[PDB]
Amino acid sequence: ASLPHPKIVKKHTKKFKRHHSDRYHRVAENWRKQKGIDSVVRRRFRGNISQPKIGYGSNKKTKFLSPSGHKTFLVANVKDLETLTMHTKTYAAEIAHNISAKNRVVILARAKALGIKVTNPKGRLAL
Amino acid sequence: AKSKNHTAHNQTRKAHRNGIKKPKTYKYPSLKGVDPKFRRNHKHALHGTAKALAAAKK
Amino acid sequence: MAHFKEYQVIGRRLPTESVPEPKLFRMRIFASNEVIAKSRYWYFLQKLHKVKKASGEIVSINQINEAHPTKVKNFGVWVRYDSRSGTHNMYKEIRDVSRVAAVETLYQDMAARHRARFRSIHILKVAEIEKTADVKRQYVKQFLTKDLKFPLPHRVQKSTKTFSYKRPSTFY
Amino acid sequence: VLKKNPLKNKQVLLRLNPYAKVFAAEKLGSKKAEKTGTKPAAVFTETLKHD
Amino acid sequence: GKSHGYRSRTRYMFQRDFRKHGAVHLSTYLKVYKVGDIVDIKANGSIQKGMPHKFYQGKTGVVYNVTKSSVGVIINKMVGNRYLEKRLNLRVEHIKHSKCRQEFLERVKANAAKRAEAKAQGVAVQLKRQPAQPRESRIVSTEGNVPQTLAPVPYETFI
Amino acid sequence: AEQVAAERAARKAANKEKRAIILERNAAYQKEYETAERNIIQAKRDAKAAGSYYVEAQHKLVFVVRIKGINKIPPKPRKVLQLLRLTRINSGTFVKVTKATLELLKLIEPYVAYGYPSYSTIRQLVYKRGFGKINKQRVPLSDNAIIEANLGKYGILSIDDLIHEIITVGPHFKQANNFLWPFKLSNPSGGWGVPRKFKHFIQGGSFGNREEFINKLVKSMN
Amino acid sequence: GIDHTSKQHKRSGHRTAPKSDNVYLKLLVKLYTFLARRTDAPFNKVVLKALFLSKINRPPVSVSRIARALKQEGAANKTVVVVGTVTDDARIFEFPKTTVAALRFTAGARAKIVKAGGECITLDQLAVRAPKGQNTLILRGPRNSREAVRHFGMGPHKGKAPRILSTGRKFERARGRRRSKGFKV
RNA sequence: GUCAAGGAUGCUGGCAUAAUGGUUAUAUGCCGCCCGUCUUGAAACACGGACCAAGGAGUCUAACGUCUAUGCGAGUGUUUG
RNA sequence: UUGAAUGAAGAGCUUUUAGUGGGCCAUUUUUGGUAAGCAGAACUGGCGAUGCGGGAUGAACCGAACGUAGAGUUAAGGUGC
RNA sequence: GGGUUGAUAUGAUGCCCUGACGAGUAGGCAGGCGUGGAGGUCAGUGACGAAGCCUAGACCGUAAGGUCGGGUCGAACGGCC
Ligand SMILES: [Mg+2]
Ligand SMILES: [Mg+2]
Ligand SMILES: [Mg+2]
Ligand SMILES: [Mg+2]
Ligand SMILES: [Mg+2]
Ligand SMILES: [Mg+2]
Ligand SMILES: [Mg+2]
Ligand SMILES: [Mg+2]
Ligand SMILES: [Mg+2]
Ligand SMILES: [Mg+2]
Ligand SMILES: [Mg+2]
Ligand SMILES: [Mg+2]
Ligand SMILES: [Mg+2]
Ligand SMILES: [Mg+2]
Ligand SMILES: [Mg+2]
Ligand SMILES: [Mg+2]
Ligand SMILES: [Mg+2]
Ligand SMILES: [Mg+2]
Ligand SMILES: [Mg+2]
Ligand SMILES: [Mg+2]
Ligand SMILES: [Mg+2]
Ligand SMILES: [Mg+2]
Ligand SMILES: [Mg+2]
Ligand SMILES: [Mg+2]
Ligand SMILES: [Mg+2]
Ligand SMILES: [Mg+2]
Ligand SMILES: [Mg+2]
Ligand SMILES: [Mg+2]
Ligand SMILES: [Mg+2]
Ligand SMILES: [Mg+2]
Ligand SMILES: [Mg+2]
Ligand SMILES: [Mg+2]
Ligand SMILES: [Mg+2]
């Protein structure tokens, strides 16, 4: 359990994909503003894709929070993990992608001992 | 190549973007253009007035 | 203009030092409301006298109700209108129970038959024809016959449903 | 934080305007006028009904 | 060819005002102009020396300099997006006093007199000008003035 | 502390005195509105009895609502609308009727609907849409204290004194009316009437002088 | 839609903090922000504003300028406050005894002030010995005496110092600068 | 003391997982012309573009202008040596 | 009530520099022409640079100018399908 | 536009209160995302698997992008100033 937070409203859950990224393979989905002079997306015609603008900004009380209600703090070892000793209801640890299987064991054990939430307690688990 | 020669379209709009400014009148205007015979006298009348005021004040 | 309203409008032409107590010109105006009534008063006094709104005043405006609103009356209406290609005078006759209903019938009649808008039309006179045989038009002299009755053939009944189960009859 | 409306919310209509209680008690907005008996002049009536 | 001379498009405007041609009457020369006097510019076309430009006719300015036969007038001229001060050496045949300023100084004298009278009393004076207020309530009598007018007229032609 | 309890008791006593002042002022205002209305009615009756006609006093106050939007306005009526503080559609202001404002209204006639507000619609406008201008910052009125803090030097202590200075165009009408932020009205709740808005009210549209019919429209927009 | 009579989202055009990363100047701005907020003396607002100023807006105030300011009637025992640098002046041969509260003093200025029995003060010692700015005299150096201000507003008949690299004969003293060659300006 | 007075609390039920929700494919309703570019005007019956990966275009220098930061301040610049 | 009304969004000032220097349309006034989706001027408002609702469709017309949403109400236009 | 220092409270390029506003080409300015290499630092990650690459699996950010899980892989590579 985390701190009590307001209900998280995201205001645009859909990814802002680039124009014609569905149409050409050279055009990746990473968002680029269309700066063309005759561009319908830039001119905002009805029926075209929405562009990212600041009105879609998340509520500051519920910003950066995961659905559990925690901000994710990236953790590489036990010394990174114990920064969240007094912040267990606010921050959840998340073990980095390059940590060993044998070091994830001691990170997870110490986080269980401290009450710190881990958002990926299943990476590199021998089953 | 034939084209537009002259128009005063948009000129009043551009003129009023930063306003039409009145020339900011001052006390003690410049004596540029005022009569030189008046100016030469007025220098001495001012000098004597300031001399007499300093004598009466000290 | 749901029904018209007749107003007396009395105006003065503002008193000056040389002439105090001016002459108080008065009209009968058919209008929707007092705003249009005062506007039409000034429109017609600018046609009759040297006065406008700036150099005059409205001293009074009173609605004139019908004296007998449930007595069926024959009205002679003298009217001047602007056609597309001139100005003409007409005299029409309207059978109705009140002057404002007669003038509404006149305005619908003129807009229908002569395509004349409200702006084109001046109501010069509405006067009740006090006795029959001074009534001049056949379309109103029809109804002034003794013991008049007429039927209404081909009654069309308005249905509230989109489907009927009876093949309806137009008797009446 | 929130604009409560007088013309609803009699608590705010009494926070503003302490006379609202006296107005509602004496009814003061449904008060009868004195029945005077003024009759208009014949010149006014015949100008009004004049053709 | 375009013509843009000093007295171009001044045909009717330096013209000499029918049955008032000829000599300039002496009160024009007998008026006294001091520095700070506000003056209207209207060019006398009979006097050709010291004429203003055709821009400056109708314009009103403040006298800054007084010479033998002329005065110097400051006219603000709208040039582009600002005004510029224009100093004009105009002979006194093209210059007369501004009656707006004359009645303004009579208003100043009247205001001073009314404030002195209200200080002789103890009452306020309220000495600003006010606009044309809406008219107050009237009772228009009908004695001798019975409201009597008929309707619009028919269309007769009288050609 | 005990001194703080003394200041609290002093503040509540001052608040009761201010409320007694406001209550007696509102009672006096109601009495003079009632007597002025009865006096005009009896003046009309008395003139009709004497055979004369009582010409009512010309209206000292208009309420002006901008009914036309932002684009395609000529510069002179645009400047007059900005000087009457009608900078968006369905903004209303009270305007003192003199000759120096009647020729403003004649200039902005195709873009506003104006008329003569009654006491009821003035009261409902200031009660519901009434906002102040305090450090320019558009403060909602909601309390007689913020009207006393800004218009109290002109003798206005409450929202009813503020209404009184509008309906009777007082000596400090300009200061009271400029304290009032322009009323952000809604669209009318039963429509405008009038299939097309931008003809005159005489011609079957909405704009122009709408003399005593502005109360119906403004109460629909309020 | 709003018919805007002004520019929307327009910044005030004034510095609200110094552009410097000087931690001691940020500390002085912190102190005079407190003293501008909590004292309601106008001196602290003026000094807080002047702490934001740039190097061309903080010209050096000479000790001769300070002494001329103390030569005013009844200003001889005031505290001269210079939000900026106080520089020396060897042209003045008699410096009085006074208290000067400045950001920086040059070594010659500090020596000249303390040689005459004076006292050189930082703006926080001024804040503890005159928190409402009592008995103070703010002095400012000359801004239009900068060399860059000579060339500002250059045009015909302005007399405003052409942007030039080498100065002499053959360097802009010819057609356009005398009646004989062409015209005069 | 209470209150409807400077912003929702009380009571109850079901579920406690794919049930709500997310992603995703599809279907339906309505909308949606191909981008870049020159142009007064581009979907143009204007031009470039078959597709993809990598490469690919305001850089550095000499001398300066405004502004800003810093050091010292009638001085200042150690670095030719 | 210090010399009319209304407004004032802070007022005044300085430095520096980008782009631009092909325009076009509409009401009204206009010149050349028989006239033009022609060529040229005046004032304004637009399009360019601008989406939205309407005119089926359209750069300019009408209404209205646009952060992300909810509810209400309308504008211009409409209400047989 | 303001409030907030004698534990503000140790985030005062902070926290908070209040009101208004938000279109945009060319253009200007600001705040940020990413890349190769350098100084410092985390006594950072790593053959118990670094980087890469694949992934209609998950999370965060309006977005630039960041993070994680699985597969493949085999020697190095990140966070912050
Ligand atoms: Mg997302
Ligand atoms: Mg996205
Ligand atoms: Mg991309
Ligand atoms: Mg385009
Ligand atoms: Mg609010
Ligand atoms: Mg000519
Ligand atoms: Mg003439
Ligand atoms: Mg409805
Ligand atoms: Mg589950
Ligand atoms: Mg679902
Ligand atoms: Mg379609
Ligand atoms: Mg272009
Ligand atoms: Mg194109
Ligand atoms: Mg090709
Ligand atoms: Mg190719
Ligand atoms: Mg590449
Ligand atoms: Mg060029
Ligand atoms: Mg050209
Ligand atoms: Mg012609
Ligand atoms: Mg466009
Ligand atoms: Mg459209
Ligand atoms: Mg339409
Ligand atoms: Mg069509
Ligand atoms: Mg259609
Ligand atoms: Mg129109
Ligand atoms: Mg809606
Ligand atoms: Mg923008
Ligand atoms: Mg690197
Ligand atoms: Mg290791
Ligand atoms: Mg790996
Ligand atoms: Mg794929
Ligand atoms: Mg190997
Ligand atoms: Mg990297």
Q: Does A14 contact strand J, using a CB cutoff of 7 Å?
A: no
For testing the chain E interface, which of C19, C24, C50 should be mutated: the one with the most E CBs within 10 Å? C24
What's the CA gap between C141 and C149, in Å, rounded? Answer: 14
Nearest CA in chain D to E149: D51
* Cα G84 versus chain centre, distance: 6
**CB of A46 within 8 A of CB of A32?**
no
The CA distance from F129 to the nearest CA of chain C, in Å, is: 28
Residues 4-43 of G with CB under 8 A from F: 4-5
DSSP-based three-state secondary structure for C135: coil
Q: Concatenate the DSSP letters of all residues of G1-56 into one string.
A: ----SS-TT---SS-SS-S---HHHHHHHHHHHHHHHHH--HHHHHHHHHHT--TT
**Chain F hits for G5, Cβ within 8 Å:** 82, 87
Alpha helices in G62-122 (DSSP H): 63-70, 107-115
Task: Show the domains of chain C with their CATH numbers.
Answer: 3-69 (3.10.20.10), 70-146 (3.10.20.10)
First to last CA, chain B: 79
For testing the chain D interface, which of E139, E140, E141, E142 should be mutated: the one with the most D CBs within 10 Å? E142
**CB of A50 within 8 A of CB of A18?**
no
- Residue F130 backbone class (left: φ over 0; alpha: ψ -120 to 50; beta: rest): beta
The CA distance from G41 to the nearest CA of chain F, in Å, is: 21
For the packed helices F119-128 and F214-221, what is the interaxial angle rounded to 10 degrees?
Answer: 20
CA C4 – ligand 27 centroid, Å: 53
User: What residues pair up with E73 in beta bridges, in sequence order?
Assistant: E63, E88
Taking C1' of I78 and every protein CA, the nearest residue is F195
**Cβ separation of E138 and F54 shorter than 8 Å?**
yes
Q: Does A97 contact strand J, using a CB cutoff of 7 Å?
A: yes
Q: Do chains G and D touch (3 or more CB pairs under 8 A)?
A: no
Sign of the C-alpha dihedral, residues E18, E23, E26, E32?
A: positive
Distance A9 CA to H19 C1' (A): 21
Q: Which nucleotides of J are covered by protein (CB under 7 A)?
A: 1, 3-5, 12-13, 18-23, 25-26, 42-51, 59-65, 67-70
Q: Can you give the resolution of this entry in Å?
A: 3.0
Q: Does A23 contact strand J, using a CB cutoff of 7 Å?
A: no
Sign of the C-alpha dihedral, residues F53, F54, F60, F62?
A: negative
**CB of E95 within 8 A of CB of E103?**
no
**Chain F hits for E136, Cβ within 8 Å:** 57-58
The phi and psi torsions of G115 (rounded to 5 degrees) equal -75, -35
Instruction: Give me F66's structure tokens.
Output: 């901008």
Residues 6+ positions from C93 with CB-CB distance below 8 Å: C74, C75, C76, C77, C129, C135, C136, C137, C139, C140
What's the CA gap between A103 and G89, in Å, rounded? Answer: 71
Alpha-carbon distances, residue F64 vs A32, A77, F91, F208 (angstroms) = 48, 71, 8, 9
- Counting Cβ atoms within 10 Å, is residue G30 exposed (0-12), middle (13-18) or buried (19+)? exposed
What's the CA gap between C43 and E102, in Å, rounded? Answer: 42
Instruction: Give me C46's structure tokens.
Output: 């600018």
**Cβ separation of C59 and F211 shorter than 8 Å?**
no
Sign of the C-alpha dihedral, residues C74, C76, C82, C84?
A: positive
**CB of C157 within 8 A of CB of C168?**
yes
CA F71 – ligand 20 centroid, Å: 17
- Return the residue matching tokens 């009125």: F141
For testing the chain F interface, which of E128, E130, E139 should be mutated: the one with the most F CBs within 10 Å? E139
Reduced 3-state DSSP string for chain E: CCCCCCCCCCCCCCCCCCCCCCCCCCHHHHCCCCCCCEEEECCCCCCCCCCCCCCCCCCEEEEEEECCCEEEEEEEEEECCEEEEEEEEEEHHHEEECHHHHHHHHHHHHHHHHHHHHHHCCCCCCCCCCCCCCCCCEEECCCCCCCCCCCCCCCCCCC
What's the CA gap between G24 and G22, in Å, rounded? Answer: 5
DSSP-based three-state secondary structure for G155: coil
Residues 6+ positions from A75 with CB-CB distance below 8 Å: A81, A84, A93, A94, A95, A96, A107, A111, A118
What's the CA gap between F128 and D29, in Å, rounded? Answer: 20
Q: For chain D, how many residues are written?
A: 51
DSSP-based three-state secondary structure for G75: coil
The phi and psi torsions of B42 (rounded to 5 degrees) equal -65, -30
DSSP H or E run through F54: strand F53-55
For the packed helices F99-107 and F75-83, what is the interaxial angle rounded to 10 degrees?
Answer: 130
**Chain D hits for E142, Cβ within 8 Å:** 43-44, 47
Which among C104, C110, C74 has a CA at the least distance from the CA of C89?
A: C110
What's the CA gap between E123 and E117, in Å, rounded? Answer: 9
The partner residue sitting opposite C35, judged by closest CB among F53, F55, F202, is F202
The CA distance from F106 to the nearest CA of chain C, in Å, is: 13
**Cβ separation of G2 and F78 shorter than 8 Å?**
no
Q: Do chains B and D touch (3 or more CB pairs under 8 A)?
A: no
Q: Concatenate the DSSP letters of all residues of C144-158 into one string.
A: GSTT------S--PP
The CA distance from B57 to the nearest CA of chain E, in Å, is: 31
Alpha-carbon distances, residue G29 vs A12, G26, G44 (angstroms) = 42, 5, 10
What's the CA gap between D43 and E148, in Å, rounded? Answer: 12
Give the nucleotide with minimal C1' distance to the Cα of F136. J19
Q: Does A73 contact strand J, using a CB cutoff of 7 Å?
A: no
Single-letter amino acid code for the residue at F101: T
- Return the residue matching tokens 């007696």: F24
Distance A57 CA to J14 C1' (A): 22
**CB of G32 within 8 A of CB of G123?**
yes
What's the CA gap between B50 and D30, in Å, rounded? Answer: 80
The phi and psi torsions of G66 (rounded to 5 degrees) equal -65, -45
Which among G18, G38, G141, G24 has a CA at the least distance from the CA of G81?
A: G141
**CB of D45 within 8 A of CB of D38?**
no
Instruction: Give me E71's structure tokens.
Output: 């005065």
DSSP H or E run through F178: helix F173-179
**CB of F89 within 8 A of CB of G1?**
yes
Q: Does A8 contact strand J, using a CB cutoff of 7 Å?
A: yes
What's the CA gap between E35 and E152, in Å, rounded? Answer: 62
What's the CA gap between C122 and C106, in Å, rounded? Answer: 11
Distance F177 CA to I6 C1' (A): 11
Taking 3-state DSSP, the helix, strand and coil percentages for chain F, each rounded to the nearest 5, stand at 50, 15, 35
Residues 6+ positions from F49 with CB-CB distance below 8 Å: D38, D39, D40, D41
Residues 99-138 of F with CB under 8 A from E: 99-101
The phi and psi torsions of C66 (rounded to 5 degrees) equal -75, 135
Q: For chain G, how many residues are written?
A: 185
Distance E14 CA to J62 C1' (A): 69
Residues 6+ positions from B32 with CB-CB distance below 8 Å: E87
Which among F69, F94, F220, F108 has a CA at the least distance from the CA of F168?
A: F94
First to last CA, chain E: 50
How many CB atoms are closer than 10 A to CB B20? 13
Instruction: Give me G37's structure tokens.
Output: 């907020």
Experimental method: cryo-EM
The phi and psi torsions of D6 (rounded to 5 degrees) equal -70, 160
What's the CA gap between E74 and E36, in Å, rounded? Answer: 10
Residues 6+ positions from G3 with CB-CB distance below 8 Å: F70, F73, F78, F81, F82, F87, F88
What's the CA gap between G37 and A112, in Å, rounded? Answer: 49
| C36 in reach of chain F (CB within 8 A) | yes
What's the CA gap between G109 and G112, in Å, rounded? Answer: 5
Which among G4, D16, D18, G8 has a CA at the least distance from the CA of F140?
A: D16
The partner residue sitting opposite E134, judged by closest CB among F50, F54, F58, is F58
What's the CA gap between F104 and F80, in Å, rounded? Answer: 6
First to last CA, chain F: 47
